[PDB]
Design a protein around this ligand. Structure first.
Ligand SMILES: Nc1ncnc2c1ncn2[C@@H]1O[C@H](COP(=O)(O)OP(=O)(O)OP(=O)(O)O)[C@@H](O)[C@H]1O
Ligand SMILES: Nc1ncnc2c1ncn2[C@@H]1O[C@H](COP(=O)(O)OP(=O)(O)OP(=O)(O)O)[C@@H](O)[C@H]1O
Ligand SMILES: Nc1ncnc2c1ncn2[C@@H]1O[C@H](COP(=O)(O)OP(=O)(O)O)[C@@H](O)[C@H]1O
Ligand SMILES: Nc1ncnc2c1ncn2[C@@H]1O[C@H](COP(=O)(O)OP(=O)(O)O)[C@@H](O)[C@H]1O
Lengths: 735, 376
């Protein structure tokens, strides 16, 4: 009448020798309920992955609790059965036929074990059960020179009739004291890929965040491994650890890595399955989970999508899941014990959406920040991946890897993995289409398929962006170095002196304004800023945030600002802020005033945004509200007037570069001198319209004449009056 | 069904060898749709064939590297394009198991029932090695989280689907096909390179694709029921600049009804094959059906020849200028950097040849012309 439902694994205590393979400490009631002899085989369902790891069984001494079961570290490493998993029991399968060859692999060693061998076979098969594809044991004591050695035994050369058995366990009948089947030591084989064994996630698999992962590992290791030392201080160790970052950074991967690499008990939630219609069922389930958590001293708590599980109460008090669950989790994690050893890992995509009650120094003082990988991190990730599938399947030199990393500057580790997968599948498809069923080893991996892969896949942001790769560069634009010397320092201040700002307390005003006459270089200056910065750029313009619906503009503003906050320290730019700046003039609606107040509060009100930098562009800065025209925010003002002689000459030469200068008949200076009162846009359009005049004669031409240029000059107008220039100058004088 | 009786070892019932006709149509049995019906999407259908053949047929080659095979395939396009027909065709031609679902029928007021059904279906798919999963109307079942807080059925199903398709197995052979009307309404969580890195887009058919579809349809109903020439099909395809395959099928159907009713009215119940299908009924049907774009504003205004046009020669010269430059000067613009200003302003007194130039241009150019009335 016990009715056992789910079982939980546990390492075998006391070490020694004992069983070490078929402990299976289970209460005799469950043994009688299964109608199977205790001196026989047992199964662990572990949900799915058929094969069920048929291992022999043994009885306990009546104190071992029913729920918990022991699978030993050897089987735990063989099947990657991590702590806290659910298990099921069923009748054993047919007896194994026989074992044929069995071959050792000598994991992470240079082999040459004959000196320390000492008839390993007896040490390997001095145990009952023992599944041939998996044996992992401690080095114990082997002759002199201590050291540690491990063996890979995954490869096999036999087959079993049932397809259910994934690891095709074999029986043991050989001889040993304190000769085999044609020896067992041969070659340093790795994990067998034929059976597709689940490869454990190594601690070195993740990279590019070495400082962050080291800090996280130390912060979670010092409470568990040094509980008495921390309790001596009397301040008690916290249990909450916060993980956040942009999507695709692999936070779940590092959670899995730290769970696998830690021998302590680990617990994780399976998403919204805990949430149920019954009010008390969820509370009872959470209480039971916490009880099982602190019943054993070494325990790890993993929480995923805490934003969905614990949404902000102020943002939406829909009901059912509400602040009550936040309060009950806070009470549960506040007082499980005085010192204890418990750490809770919470991963959320949007920290702002999380309940601010969770984000408090009293409960979640320690935070871990993960950002977008840079060039070095992406290069390291690519090198790790190439080492992961080995040089036998691809050829890529270090310079090629660096070039690929530089080309894909806006990507992430998940993006790189998807790029590798798509490159592999496109290479396979090309080989199938062209080479007519050739061996895949000859074609391997090249550069053209990968280049086409990054061309086709496109960055995962799915938003329009110049990206600086296919757009205008610095050499294509000729301007004045006076503004360049200013902007380089201005945008190198935050990216390079964040620690200096933190130490000194001066911080950054984060306010820059650019005003220019119509037809001048203002959006050009913004593009130059974005190009030189080399950071993701959001193309936002004034009327874009405006919408017919009331309140939609505020929603769009909040969306773009929380996207910029999560898009690393960058620059946010407004193409035409003159649409919303004037409120007193023109009798602006209440929506414009609300948007202006919201942006005023966002720039330098109540909160400070250290990450993003606000740059604004206006067609006319004289009608702007006095609230925004305040020192501290958007204080810097640059005249950035029309291009001077050298800049105009460079622009003309760049436009004439497509043409031929020798046969053009111009010296590239007389045209600039004559076209001095025109705007930059008009100057650019002059070359195109003169080319049209030249090609008027017989369509495609190779010669341009002075009469065409004269007609082009006569047929166009500058459209700029001295009155607006005088007004713009008066704006500078008045400020 | 009827029982079998044979007199022999290792004479039938009055011979069995007679003709090589197709399946009997009197019973009107369903016919397994094949790739012959689909036409005009050769590149897209080949890409879909590759994407469905690479993981299922030879998963070991892809799994030997260790990067795991892709599991998510995304399909999207304008309504009525025929993507769901491609889904049914690949289901019929595939010998592997499929998991086509109804959609909202599974969704109920009980949150646990839907989760249990999802369990059962995905364990059924995973347990048997050859299995395919077909999911349609992705935007509904999984609305965008940022769009609205619908509640009940919400991003929880997105999370459980992601956890399901993340780790079904090491190599396996399992793919999921998602068909959505608009990719924008799809939850961005699904639209991820880790989940849906492969995207299949089936755009609106062009003139060649529409012509291929019409030819395939005519070959399907055979020449017994109609007499159409290649130039007639080409003209019909050219006239239908924006129609889709569903629109072409509707045009054929309405032409059939118009022909039937005209024959009944005039010929007084004449033989059906005598009148078959002509071109005048098709023209009347495409005129009366209204173009594919519902409530369109870029209308197809009529054309008129040059000798019916009267005006100054300077405007005609600028006309020829601005049409001859872009069509046959793209290489010149690319090499010279002139590009295309694409901006022309027409200002003048009302009622004197302001729109006459545009009308003559629509006539002469032959390119698909579109015009908008301003106040409309
Ligand atoms: N930096 C990286 N280096 C190598 N592989 C990576 C990297 N980032 C992601 N990947 C690959 O992409 C997969 C996705 O990682 P993971 O599931 O941890 O994503 P995540 O960013 O935590 O997001 P989500 O929770 O939505 O899955 C990894 O299992 C791995 O195969
Ligand atoms: N290539 C084609 N050949 C013949 N008929 C076609 C073709 N493409 C589409 N059709 C027609 O279009 C219709 C199929 O519409 P279907 O529902 O499959 O489209 P869909 O683009 O998947 O959109 P929906 O979201 O409505 O399912 C049928 O009437 C079919 O005859
Ligand atoms: N040297 C150049 N080459 C190409 N395009 C240019 C050049 N200088 C300016 N432009 C274009 O002219 C535009 C300048 O806009 P601008 O007149 O400053 O806007 P506003 O009228 O609001 O001040 C930019 O969008 C840019 O694309
Ligand atoms: N040769 C012609 N004979 C009869 N009608 C004509 C002829 N040429 C043009 N039209 C008519 O004159 C109209 C010209 O429109 P138009 O006056 O340019 O528009 P708008 O009133 O905007 O200036 C056309 O709608 C056309 O029907």
């Amino acid at each position: 009448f016990k009715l056992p439902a789910e079982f939980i694994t546990r390492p075998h205590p006391s070490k020694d020798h004992g069983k070490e393979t078929c402990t299976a400490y289970i209460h005799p009631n469950v043994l009688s309920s299964l109608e199977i002899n205790p001196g026989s085989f047992c199964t662990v369902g572990k949900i799915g992955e058929n094969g069920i790891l048929v291992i022999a069984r043994a009885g306990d001494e009546e104190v071992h609790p029913v729920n918990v079961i022991t699978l030993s570290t050897t089987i735990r490493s063989v099947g990657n059965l991590i702590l806290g998993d659910r298990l099921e029991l069923k009748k054993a399968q047919v007896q194994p036929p026989y074992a044929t060859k069995v071959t050792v692999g000598s994991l992470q060693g240079y082999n040459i074990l004959e000196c320390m061998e000492e008839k390993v076979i007896q040490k390997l098969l001095d145990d009952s059960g023992v599944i041939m594809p998996g044996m992992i044991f401690q080095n114990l004591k082997t002759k002199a020179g201590d050291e540690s050695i491990d063996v890979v035994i995954t490869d096999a050369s036999d087959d079993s009739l049932p397809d259910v058995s994934q690891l095709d366990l074999n029986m043991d009948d050989m001889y040993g004291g304190l000769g085999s089947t044609h020896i067992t030591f041969s070659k340093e084989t790795q994990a067998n890929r034929k059976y597709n064994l689940p490869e454990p996630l190594s601690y070195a698999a993740v990279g590019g965040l070495d400082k962050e992962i080291e800090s996280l590992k130390s912060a979670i290791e010092i409470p568990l491994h040094q509980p008495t030392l921390f309790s001596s201080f009397g301040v008690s160790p916290p249990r909450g650890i916060l993980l956040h970052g942009p999507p695709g950074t692999g936070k779940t991967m590092l959670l899995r890595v730290v769970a696998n690499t830690s021998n302590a008990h680990v617990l994780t939630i399976n998403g919204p399955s805990i949430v149920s219609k019954y009010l008390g069922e969820t509370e009872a389930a959470l209480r039971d989970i916490f009880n099982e958590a602190r019943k054993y001293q070494p325990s790890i708590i993993f929480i995923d999508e805490i934003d969905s599980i614990a949404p902000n109460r102020a943002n939406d008090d829909s009901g059912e899941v509400e602040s009550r669950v936040v309060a009950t989790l806070l009470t549960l994690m506040d007082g499980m014990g005085a010192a204890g050893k418990v750490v809770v890992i919470a991963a959320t995509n949007r920290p702002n959406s999380v309940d601010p009650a969770l984000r408090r120094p009293g409960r979640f003082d320690q935070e871990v920040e993960i950002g977008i990988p840079d060039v070095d991190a992406r290069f390291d990730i690519l090198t790790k991946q190439f080492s992961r599938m080995s040089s036998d399947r691809h050829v890529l030199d270090s310079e090629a890897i660096k070039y690929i990393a530089s080309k894909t500057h806006g990507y992430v580790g998940a993006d790189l993995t998807a790029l590798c997968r798509e490159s592999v599948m496109k290479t396979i498809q090309r080989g199938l289409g062209t080479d007519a069923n050739i061996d895949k080893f000859s074609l391997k991996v090249t550069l053209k398929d990968v280049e086409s892969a990054m061309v086709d896949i496109r960055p995962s942001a799915m938003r329009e962006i110049f990206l600086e790769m296919p757009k205008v560069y610095w050499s294509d634009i000729g301007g004045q170095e006076e503004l360049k010397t200013k902007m380089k320092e201005m945008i190198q201040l935050p990216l390079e002196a964040s620690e200096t700002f933190a130490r000194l307390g001066i911080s950054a005003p984060k306010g820059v304004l650019l005003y220019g006459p119509p037809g001048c270089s203002k959006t050009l200056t913004a593009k130059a800023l974005a190009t030189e910065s080399g950071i993701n750029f959001l193309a936002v313009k004034g009327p874009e945030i405006f919408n017919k619906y009331v309140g939609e503009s505020e929603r769009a503003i909040r969306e773009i600002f929380r996207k910029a906050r999560s898009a690393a320290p960058s620059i946010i730019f407004f193409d035409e802020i003159d649409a919303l700046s004037p409120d007193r003039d023109g009798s602006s609606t209440s929506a414009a005033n609300h948007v202006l107040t919201s942006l005023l509060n966002e720039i330098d009100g109540v909160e400070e945004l250290k990450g993003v930098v606000i740059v604004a562009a206006t067609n006319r800065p004289d009608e702007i509200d006095a609230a925004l025209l305040r020192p501290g925010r958007l204080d810097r003002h640059i005249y950035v007037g029309p291009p001077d002689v050298n800049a105009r000459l460079e622009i003309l030469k760049k436009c004439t570069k497509k043409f031929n200068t020798e046969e053009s008949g111009v010296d590239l200076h007389e045209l600039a001198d004559r076209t001095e009162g025109y705007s930059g846009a008009e100057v650019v359009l002059l070359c195109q319209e003169a080319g049209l005049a030249a090609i008027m004669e017989d369509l495609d031409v190779a010669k341009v004449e002075l009469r065409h240029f004269e007609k082009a000059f006569k047929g166009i107008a500058r459209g700029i009056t001295p009155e607006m220039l005088s007004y713009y100058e008066e704006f500078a004088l008045r400020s």
